[PDB]
Amino acid sequence: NLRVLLDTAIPPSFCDTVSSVLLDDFNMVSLIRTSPADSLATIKQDNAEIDIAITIDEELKISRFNQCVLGYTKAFVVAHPQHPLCNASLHSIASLANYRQISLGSRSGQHSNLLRPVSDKVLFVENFDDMLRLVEAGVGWGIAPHYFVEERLRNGTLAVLSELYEPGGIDTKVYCYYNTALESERSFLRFLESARQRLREL
Amino acid sequence: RNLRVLLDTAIPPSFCDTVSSVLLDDFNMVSLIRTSPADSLATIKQDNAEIDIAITIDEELKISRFNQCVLGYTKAFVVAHPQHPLCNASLHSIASLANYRQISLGSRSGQHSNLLRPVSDKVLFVENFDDMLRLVEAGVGWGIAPHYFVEERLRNGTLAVLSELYEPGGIDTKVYCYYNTALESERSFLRFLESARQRLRELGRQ
Ligand SMILES: Nc1cc(NCc2ccc(F)cc2)cc(C(F)(F)F)n1
Numbered sequence: 111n112l113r114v115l116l117d118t119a120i121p122p123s124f125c126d127t128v129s130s131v132l133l134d135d136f137n138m139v140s141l142i143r144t145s146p147a148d149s150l151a152t153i154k155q156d157n158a159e160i161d162i163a164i165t166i167d168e169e170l171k172i173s174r175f176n177q178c179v180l181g182y183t184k185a186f187v188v189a190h191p192q193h194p195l196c197n198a199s200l201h202s203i204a205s206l207a208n209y210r211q212i213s214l215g216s217r218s219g220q221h222s223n224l225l226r227p228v229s230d231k232v233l234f235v236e237n238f239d240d241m242l243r244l245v246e247a248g249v250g251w252g253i254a255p256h257y258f259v260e261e262r263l264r265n266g267t268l269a270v271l272s273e274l275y276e277p278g279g280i281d282t283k284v285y286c287y288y289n290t291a292l293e294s295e296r297s298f299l300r301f302l303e304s305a306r307q308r309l310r311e312l
Numbered sequence: 313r314n315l316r317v318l319l320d321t322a323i324p325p326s327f328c329d330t331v332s333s334v335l336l337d338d339f340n341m342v343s344l345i346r347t348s349p350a351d352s353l354a355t356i357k358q359d360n361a362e363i364d365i366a367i368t369i370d371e372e373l374k375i376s377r378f379n380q381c382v383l384g385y386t387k388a389f390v391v392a393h394p395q396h397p398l399c400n401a402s403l404h405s406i407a408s409l410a411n412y413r414q415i416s417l418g419s420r421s422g423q424h425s426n427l428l429r430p431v432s433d434k435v436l437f438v439e440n441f442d443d444m445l446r447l448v449e450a451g452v453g454w455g456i457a458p459h460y461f462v463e464e465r466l467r468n469g470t471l472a473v474l475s476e477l478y479e480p481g482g483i484d485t486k487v488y489c490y491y492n493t494a495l496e497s498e499r500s501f502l503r504f505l506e507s508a509r510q511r512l513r514e515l516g517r518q
């Protein structure tokens with residue numbers, strides 16, 4: 111009955127708030143997980159037929175889809191603890207362009223201004239697991255969700271560079287692209303109010 | 313030592329004052345310049361400007377002599393005359409605004425950041441927010457204004473809000489602090505961030 115997309119930047123607990131509420135208001139609900147780079151691309155395929163998409167990727171004026179914001183989530187710039195930029199007593203973002211970045215997506219296929227790699231030296235990866243596997247190996251630095259790096263930080267396995275730029279992580283809007291048709295449905299509005307309220311708690 | 317600072321007209325006054333008190337504490341001399349967010353970044357790009365810090369909502373990465381950080385947040389509303397067509401629609405979307413005229417900031421000539429770029433094809437520009445609301449209240453169109461600038465006109469029913477579906481309670485907008493690269497290695501600048509940020513957080517709670 112309903113098909114929903116959540117990118118891998120949405121913390122898992124939110125994928126839970128979406129499930130419980132939609133299943134309450136609809137008969138059948140389908141869930142798909144994709145990288146934030148592949149989120150908007152997936153819903154644009156005519157054969158996809160995806161009704162809702164919850165992602166951080168920004169892109170205004172999408173056919174058949176309207177946009178709104180559900181809340182926020184945090185993301186950190188991370189690098190191997192012994193990475194050079196960690197040891198730099200003073201941290202800056204202007205300098206990161208000079209080091210290799212482990213980013214998402216592919217070279218072919220445009221990246222939104224949000225996920226576009228900053229560095230000239232870039233190494234792409236399919237998911238967040240592969241990014242950290244290389245970053246922990248000191249290959250480079252990357253931008254990951256809070257929940258995806260919460261443990262590796264607690265255990266000193268990984269460092270943070272974003273504390274000067276935005277302490278406590280870098281707030282990222284969480285957009286909800288909803289098929290324009292759903293706008294006239296009492297069930298959908300009930301989903302937003304609840305989904306947003308639950309998302310605030312974090 | 314001497315500091316010259318720019319704050320755009322989207323920064324609420326309590327936000328501006330909170331920044332002022334901290335700069336005067338950590339620096340000897342401080343000067344303030346106020347501009348619309350559309351002209352904020354443009355002003356510091358002029359070499360003759362000689363502006364050391366610029367606090368604005370405008371986005372632009374890779375600025376010469378300037379680095380960027382986040383200082384805090386502020387709220388913004390889409391507003392229109394209460395009897396505006398879109399008001400009668402109990403539920404609004406952003407795809408529909410493109411067909412109505414927008415009262416925006418900036419100039420017609422001169423590139424617009426992706427943030428402040430007007431959304432509608434029919435647009436009418438204004439230099440400051442006062443002129444924007446003057447036209448919006450006259451029903452000429454809709455606009456994007458800071459929370460503090462329209463809080464009064466909303467309480468008095470003089471003006472309506474269209475953004476409650478998009479982002480209830482206002483549209484959170486990051487407030488960046490563009491700082492001359494030189495300040496990065498100055499103990500005064502770091503104390504200013506640490507203090508200004510802490511005070512702005514406590515303030516945001518209130
Ligand atoms: N590329 C990217 C950007 C994100 N936020 C915007 C941002 C841009 C620059 C910066 F330094 C920090 C954050 C979040 C993620 C994700 F991994 F969390 F999904 N990735």
Ligand SMILES: Nc1cc(NCc2ccc(F)cc2)cc(C(F)(F)F)n1
Nearest residue numbers: 322349388427428456457458483485
């Ligand atoms: N143009 C503009 C954009 C702002 N935020 C980005 C944004 C864009 C669309 C939207 F619906 C909500 C927010 C804030 C302001 C200001 F007046 F508050 F400064 N102006």
